[PDB]
Amino acid sequence: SPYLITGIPKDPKHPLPIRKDIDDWYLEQTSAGSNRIQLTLFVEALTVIQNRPLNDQLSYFRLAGIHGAPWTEWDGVPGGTGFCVHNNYTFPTWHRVYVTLYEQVIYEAMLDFIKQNVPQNGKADWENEAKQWRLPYWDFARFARHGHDGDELRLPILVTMPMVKVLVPGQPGKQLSKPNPLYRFQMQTLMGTLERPYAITFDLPFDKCQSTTKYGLLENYNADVWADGGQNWLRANLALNEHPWYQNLDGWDSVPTLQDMTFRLLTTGGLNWGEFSSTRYDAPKNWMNLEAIHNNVHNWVGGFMFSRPGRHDLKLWGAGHMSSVPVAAYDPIFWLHHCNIDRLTAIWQTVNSGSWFNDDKSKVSKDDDLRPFHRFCEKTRKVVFFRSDDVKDWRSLNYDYAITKDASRIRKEISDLYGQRTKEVYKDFGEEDYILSIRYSRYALGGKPFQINIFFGDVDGKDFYDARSQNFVGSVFNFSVLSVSQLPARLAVHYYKKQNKGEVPTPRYVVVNSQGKAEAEVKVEVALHKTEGTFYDYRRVADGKRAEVDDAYRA
Amino acid sequence: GSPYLITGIPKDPKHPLPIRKDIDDWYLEQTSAGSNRIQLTLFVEALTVIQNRPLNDQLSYFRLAGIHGAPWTEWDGVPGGQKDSKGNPTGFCVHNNYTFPTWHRVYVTLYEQVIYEAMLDFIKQNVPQNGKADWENEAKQWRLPYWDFARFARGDELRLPILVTMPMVKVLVPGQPGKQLSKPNPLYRFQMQTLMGTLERPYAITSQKTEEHGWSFDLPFDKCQSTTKYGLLENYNADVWADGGQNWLRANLALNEHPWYQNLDGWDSVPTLQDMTFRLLTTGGLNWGEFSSTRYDDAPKNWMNLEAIHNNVHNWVGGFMFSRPGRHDLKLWGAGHMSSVPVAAYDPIFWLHHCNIDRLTAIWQTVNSGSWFNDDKSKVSKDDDLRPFHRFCEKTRKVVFFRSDDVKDWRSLNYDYAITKDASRIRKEISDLYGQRTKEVYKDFGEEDYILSIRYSRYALGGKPFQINIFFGDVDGKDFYDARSQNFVGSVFNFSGSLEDSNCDKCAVLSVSQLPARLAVHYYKKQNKGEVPTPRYVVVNSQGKAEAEVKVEVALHKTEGTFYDYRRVADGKRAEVDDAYRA
Ligand SMILES: [Cu+2]
Ligand SMILES: [Cu+2]
Ligand SMILES: [Cu+2]
Ligand SMILES: [Cu+2]
């Protein structure tokens, strides 16, 4: 302390190693053409980091603690209202440094593991693998690879495995199945009981969790179930593949909204940095932003609803860490999600070279200290805080992405990964585009999170939640001066028009809280906009209206 | 060593006949203000010890579970490797025969006894001298809790036990009052150190894929290190199958299966499992052969049987479909150990399920006291050796196998159930626990009853499992699976295994179930001008495809007045599905 964040140190033998897609990396590592060493190193190093004591500021707990709860100091920097930047233009750059911190800590732990565990004849080889390793990213917008015995988005293979097989150093040809540190983070006692001042202690019972969970916290189950609510990865995958309700009807092709949004984000030109970088709002075509997409992914991975009114056999609710800004960083997938958010930023930067804190709005924030992150400044000869300009070129942190390495085919790569399905399905219909604009206050529920669901047509007063809900079009999640997001609406409008003799729909919205109830006093500005031509001159064509729900479902 | 005499927990005169408690009530008591938490600690610690015993210890968890089915080895000196008349591997368990309840009664007792013996060891080893008397007192009161699968958990719904849904559980630290430690919960799952397909010879869990003859399973159980509920799905990386998880919410959903229409607005629901259980316990006049088994030997009202209900619960807890054809974002399939005869006993909930099956047998015996292997068909099986379970015959002074008469009075094994101890109240208790909701919902409609009869062959797919789904109305050709499927009425699961005739001479059978249909008929009539529905059936395999060649006799029957004299009113017909969904 101060812990100097440098990125993995430069070695001439390892020029700008890449952060790989975690699925591609896992498949590579578990093939006979791999020594399986990088997999073993990541698992063993992250296990050590997770098991470190709380007084160790490089423990997993304390590293995750930087983001939000328990709101303590870190690296001598006063804390406590966490350190993470949200709803501001430094959202991408603060998180760029945070991810690099995690990567660097893991690398250092890998080197220690080698020193304590690897025989002499293997040390050079194991060190060599550690120096080439970079933190993989979870490509949340790319169709998963599978046997096809359709295509869908998925959580990483590794995140869905409670156990993982790794090498046993010193015993050639021997492998052992061990608990997988990417599956969850678990402490030895409930997090609400940790020694002061680190206790996690909220309208979700995170104090009653020993393990991080995805969708595992539901009301009206015994509280001891919450100690480890499990990883409902199939449910998370379902949420990640959110799309309009009509697409589940026979005869229609589906397009995951997350992929459509990500394709739009990467291919739409002309945004300034303030528009791209954040939900912050002090041109609705420009409201598709990195942070809003990131917010929905948090929601879809973790779940935010603890309850639902009424009677339901099929229960699609359930809450978990990733939906909650104070505790999301405890879930190991947090870091892989943010690794991809960093990749998306790098891609956008590559195809928008001039647009860096350029506009009058974001310019104010450019020189913000990115607390609590320290580095040694070459220009002033002293320890300072990171600033956004320090990480404009992510390569200065000694990592890269394949997609930005060979950027000569970047637009082709973007289309191949994120645009094929959208184009395939859109091309069946007329050359017009529709988008939804959404503007809200993140503070509208006193700071509490909520979800804004939009519908075209009649709203089921007892089912206004998800893609299973009649006439659902899409959602915007308040992960928590206004905030904005954008949704694709082209295909949902087409369907509505087919049922309603060509009429444009009124966007109807419901604001849903963590109890699954509709909030009547949260203002949301929603509008539908149309342009001629396909997205790959928008005009407002319908104003939003709040939908009513059943009395028992009202907050 | 051998023989291991199965006696039940030894008699302690301080506590003459302790009760096997409802596992949720017991857990709630053990964690409530006022409780010492000693029994919970003992069960967790003892079961953990048993689970960690080596494969060559026949009292290890693995070897006890191994008695039921795979890997089909010897136990207590009784040889394994049995093959049925078609060459299929067969284990010791009895299915589709009238000794189904009595074989399993002894099996559950074995488990309980082994756990109790491990509790005494734990106390002698870990508990300080000044606390040994108190801990021994609790161990001697403990009996294996039952999972009441048909009781609303504390709207109302059926649920897996609280304890089974907890990956971790807090237990006492013996030498330190007030102190607890969270430990992995041995009731959540059973996990070995390697994939079960790679265990030391001869214990590996392997299918007949590289065997000389027979069929046993095709789900990738050889690729599991842990037992799983709904965790095995096709088109995911095989490393996910090492531990597919406990999808307990999905299991709860299956356990609450009811007709499709009940999810529409304005309708009250009744869980079919509870309605079936209430019918099973209250319908008079069945003989032992009718009650005890799915086995049919040559009146549909008497086709509601213990084994069929048990079969459906196996399916609902574990899942049996590995895949589904076509495009589906919401994935309701997924398979696991409890659906599969060869490996179900590895899942710790198996024993709690069978504990309740034993309790249901005891309840039924209590209110049908003159019906014990009483009919010509079942009397033939009364004296079968319940291999591999040994006991001492006092009369001949030799070790013999258990036989059904030895366990007619379960109290001879030194346990009881609250519901059979206070027998004067038994019918009121059955109503309070299993009948209140059925009666409240039925009362809104006409005074008449409808039931579906189902007769099938367990061996229709060469031993493979399948599920028979019944519908009233048009069947969705891409969705013919469960309560989410349009017009679904109910299901019958073929908990399939070998022919279990290994000892028969070479030179020398149908199954039945019954479904409630009253409420579904009411809804169908409401949508079709009062028309009586033709039951439509689809036979579904593990790949989620319809088997057109599996023959099923389905009929709808009606009586005047409520069940709490049936006449056939419609015959069933097979429904076709989409071409891509056809086997
Ligand atoms: Cu953040
Ligand atoms: Cu985030
Ligand atoms: Cu059995
Ligand atoms: Cu069974």
Q: Which helix (H) or strand (E) holds A468?
A: none
Q: Is A463:A470 a contact under the CB 8 Å cutoff?
A: yes
Closest CA to B244 of B318, B161, B349: B318
Distance from CA of B463 to the nearest CA of A (A): 24
Cβ count near B268 (within 10 Å): 14
Distance from CA of B470 to the nearest CA of A (A): 20
Start-to-end Cα distance in chain B: 50
Per-residue DSSP letters for B274-341?
A: HHHHHHHHH-----HHHHH-SEE---GGG---HHHHHHHHHHHHH-EE---SS--SS---EE-GGG-T
Q: Is A205:A221 a contact under the CB 8 Å cutoff?
A: no
Tracing tokens 């023989």 back to the chain, one arrives at B3
Cβ count near A348 (within 10 Å): 20
Torsion of CA B451, B452, B456, B458, to 10 degrees: -60
Distance from the CA of B378 to the center of ligand 4, in angstroms?
19
Q: Do B168 and A210 touch (CB under 8 A)?
A: yes
Q: Is A30:A161 a contact under the CB 8 Å cutoff?
A: no
Closest CA to A43 of A126, A114, A110: A110
Where do the structural domains in chain B lie, given as residue ranges?
Answer: 1-435, 436-583
Q: Do A315 and B167 touch (CB under 8 A)?
A: no
Interatomic CA distance for residues A333 and A138, integer angstroms: 8
C-alpha A482, offset from chain centre = 21
Which tokens sit at B437?
Answer: 């909701």
Q: Is A510:A518 a contact under the CB 8 Å cutoff?
A: yes
B464: left (phi over 0), alpha (psi -120 to 50) or beta: beta
Q: Quick check: A482 contacting B, CB < 8 Å?
A: no
Q: Quick check: A222 contacting B, CB < 8 Å?
A: yes
Interatomic CA distance for residues B498 and B466, integer angstroms: 14
Q: Where are the alpha helices (DSSP H) in A268-409?
A: 273-277, 290-302, 333-351, 360-363, 402-405
Interatomic CA distance for residues A244 and A495, integer angstroms: 10
Q: Which helix (H) or strand (E) holds A164?
A: strand A163-167
Residue numbers of B between 164 and 183 with CB closer than 8 Å to A: 165-170, 182
Cβ count near A126 (within 10 Å): 24
Interatomic CA distance for residues B360 and B148, integer angstroms: 10
Around ion ligand 1, which residues have CB less than 5 A away?
A: A 84
Interatomic CA distance for residues A498 and B289, integer angstroms: 60
Interatomic CA distance for residues B258 and A387, integer angstroms: 60
Resolution in A: 1.4
Per-residue DSSP letters for B219-288?
A: SSGGG-SB--BS-B-TTS-GGGGGG--B-HHHHHHHHT---GGGGSTT-----HHHHHHHHHHH-----H
Residues 6+ apart with CB under 8 A from B19: B143, B415, B416, B417, B418, B421
Distance from the CA of B281 to the center of ligand 3, in angstroms?
21
Interatomic CA distance for residues B102 and B372, integer angstroms: 11
Tracing tokens 């048909």 back to the chain, one arrives at B150
Residues 6+ apart with CB under 8 A from A131: A8, A11, A13, A14, A17
Residues 6+ apart with CB under 8 A from A171: none
Rg (CA), chain B: 23
Q: Is B300:B557 a contact under the CB 8 Å cutoff?
A: yes
Torsion of CA B555, B561, B562, B565, to 10 degrees: -50
Which tokens sit at A147?
Answer: 């046997």
Q: Is A539:A530 a contact under the CB 8 Å cutoff?
A: yes
The SS3 call for residue B532 is: coil
Q: Is A338:A322 a contact under the CB 8 Å cutoff?
A: no
Per-residue DSSP letters for B420-482?
A: HHSGGGHHHHHIIIIIHHHHHHHTTS-SEEEEEEEEEETTTTTT--EEEEEEESPPBTTB-SS
Domain A420-555 has CATH 1.10.760.10: no
Q: Is A477:A298 a contact under the CB 8 Å cutoff?
A: yes
Q: Inter-axis angle of helices B23-31 and B38-51, to 10 degrees?
A: 120
Per-residue DSSP letters for B165-204?
A: G-SEEEEE-TTSTT-EEEEE-TTT--B-SS-GGGSSTT--
Architecture of domain B436-583: Sandwich (2.60)
Distance from the CA of B350 to the center of ligand 4, in angstroms?
7
Closest CA to B291 of B407, B409, B406, B370: B370
b/e sequence B339-365, b meaning 16+ C-beta within 10 Å: bbbbbbbbbbbbbbbbbbbbbbbbbbb
Interatomic CA distance for residues B325 and B160, integer angstroms: 29
Q: Which helix (H) or strand (E) holds B536?
A: strand B535-540
Closest CA to A451 of A299, A333, A292: A299
Per-residue DSSP letters for A31-79?
A: STTS--HHHHHHHHHHHHHHHS-TT-TTSHHHHHHTTBTB---BTTB--
Q: Do B329 and A254 touch (CB under 8 A)?
A: yes
Q: Which helix (H) or strand (E) holds A527?
A: strand A524-532
Q: Do A315 and B253 touch (CB under 8 A)?
A: yes
* B535 phi, psi to nearest 5 deg: -65, 135
Interatomic CA distance for residues A233 and A215, integer angstroms: 9
Tracing tokens 């899409």 back to the chain, one arrives at A474
Q: Do A318 and B249 touch (CB under 8 A)?
A: yes
Q: Which residue of B has its CA nearest to A461?
A: B265
| B506 burial type by CB count under 10 A (0-12 exposed, 13-18 middle, 19+ buried) | exposed
Q: Which helix (H) or strand (E) holds A4?
A: none
Handedness of CA B356, B361, B367, B369 (dihedral sign): negative
The SS3 call for residue B547 is: coil
Distance from the CA of B388 to the center of ligand 4, in angstroms?
17
Q: Is A16:A400 a contact under the CB 8 Å cutoff?
A: yes
| Angle, CA of B257, A228 and A218, to the nearest 5° | 50
Residue numbers of B between 234 and 253 with CB closer than 8 Å to A: 234-237, 239-240, 242-243, 245-249, 253
SS3 per-residue string spanning B488-528: EEEEEEECCCCCCCCCCCCCCCEEEEEEECHHHHHHHHHHC
Interatomic CA distance for residues A441 and B9, integer angstroms: 65
DSSP-derived secondary structure letter, B48: H
Distance from CA of A376 to the nearest CA of B (A): 43
> Which ligand neighbours the alpha carbon of A297 most closely?
2
Interatomic CA distance for residues B306 and B313, integer angstroms: 11
Interatomic CA distance for residues B224 and A236, integer angstroms: 23
| A355 burial type by CB count under 10 A (0-12 exposed, 13-18 middle, 19+ buried) | buried
B401-406 contacts, C-beta under 8 A, 24 or more apart: B402/B6, B402/B106, B404/B99, B404/B102, B404/B373
Q: Which residue of A has its CA nearest to B192?
A: A177
Interatomic CA distance for residues B375 and B264, integer angstroms: 45
Handedness of CA A493, A496, A502, A508 (dihedral sign): negative
Q: Do A224 and B31 touch (CB under 8 A)?
A: yes
Q: Is A348:A342 a contact under the CB 8 Å cutoff?
A: no
Q: Do A241 and B329 touch (CB under 8 A)?
A: yes
Q: Is A10:A398 a contact under the CB 8 Å cutoff?
A: yes
Cβ count near A288 (within 10 Å): 27
Q: Is B417:B121 a contact under the CB 8 Å cutoff?
A: no
Q: Is B217:B340 a contact under the CB 8 Å cutoff?
A: yes
Q: Quick check: B35 contacting A, CB < 8 Å?
A: no
Which tokens sit at B451?
Answer: 């039931």
The SS3 call for residue A329 is: helix
Question: How much of chain A is in helix, strand and coil states, percent to nearest 5?
Answer: 35, 15, 45
Around ion ligand 3, which residues have CB less than 5 A away?
A: B 93
Q: Are strands B535-540 and B573-574 parallel, antiparallel or unpaired?
A: parallel
Distance from the CA of A168 to the center of ligand 3, in angstroms?
39
> Which residues of chain A are within 8 Å of residue B334 when distances are taken between CB atoms?
234
The Cα-based distances of B241 to A151, B198, B464, B525 in angstroms read: 21, 14, 21, 45
Handedness of CA A148, A150, A153, A155 (dihedral sign): negative
Distance from the CA of B39 to the center of ligand 1, in angstroms?
45
Residues 6+ apart with CB under 8 A from A323: A298, A299, A301, A302, A303, A304, A449, A477, A479
In a 13 Å sphere around the CA of A462, the CA atoms on its Cβ side amount to 9
Domain B1-435 has CATH 3.90.550.10: no
Cβ count near B173 (within 10 Å): 12
Q: Is A485:A286 a contact under the CB 8 Å cutoff?
A: no
Q: Which helix (H) or strand (E) holds A377?
A: strand A374-377
Q: Which of B166, B223, B230 to mutate to test the interface with A (most CBs of A within 10 A)?
A: B166
Q: Which residue in A149, A211, A224 is closest to B234 by CB distance?
A: A149
The Cα-based distances of B410 to A121, B60, B404, B413, B436 in angstroms read: 65, 25, 11, 6, 28
The SS3 call for residue B555 is: strand
Interatomic CA distance for residues B164 and A225, integer angstroms: 9
Counting every residue written for chain A, the total comes to 555
The SS3 call for residue B529 is: coil
Start-to-end Cα distance in chain A: 48
C-alpha B506, offset from chain centre = 32
b/e sequence B532-547, b meaning 16+ C-beta within 10 Å: ebbbbbbbbbbbbbbb
Residue numbers of B between 122 and 161 with CB closer than 8 Å to A: 155, 157
Q: Quick check: B225 contacting A, CB < 8 Å?
A: yes
Q: Do B484 and A314 touch (CB under 8 A)?
A: yes
C-alpha B370, offset from chain centre = 26
Per-residue DSSP letters for B126-151?
A: HS-GGGHHHHHHHHHH----B--TTS
B482 residue type, one letter:
D
Superfamily of domain A1-419 in the CATH hierarchy: Di-copper center containing domain from catechol oxidase (1.10.1280.10)
Q: Which helix (H) or strand (E) holds B568?
A: strand B567-571
Counting every residue written for chain B, the total comes to 583
Q: Is A329:A124 a contact under the CB 8 Å cutoff?
A: no
Q: Is A153:A142 a contact under the CB 8 Å cutoff?
A: yes
* A350 phi, psi to nearest 5 deg: -60, -40
Distance from CA of A542 to the nearest CA of B (A): 30
Interatomic CA distance for residues B543 and B485, integer angstroms: 17
A542 bridge partner residues: A528
Q: Which helix (H) or strand (E) holds A321?
A: none
Q: Do A314 and B226 touch (CB under 8 A)?
A: no
Q: Quick check: B334 contacting A, CB < 8 Å?
A: yes
Q: Quick check: A13 contacting B, CB < 8 Å?
A: no
Q: Quick check: B227 contacting A, CB < 8 Å?
A: no
Per-residue DSSP letters for A176-211?
A: EEEE-TTT--B-SS-GGGSSTT------S-GGG-SB
Q: Is B531:B521 a contact under the CB 8 Å cutoff?
A: no
Q: Do A147 and B234 touch (CB under 8 A)?
A: yes
Handedness of CA B292, B293, B296, B302 (dihedral sign): positive
A433 bridge partner residues: A531
Q: Which of A28, A191, A222 to mutate to test the interface with B (most CBs of B within 10 A)?
A: A222
| A446 burial type by CB count under 10 A (0-12 exposed, 13-18 middle, 19+ buried) | exposed
Interatomic CA distance for residues B379 and B371, integer angstroms: 11
Handedness of CA A469, A472, A474, A477 (dihedral sign): negative
The SS3 call for residue A267 is: helix
Q: Which residue of A has its CA nearest to B477?
A: A250
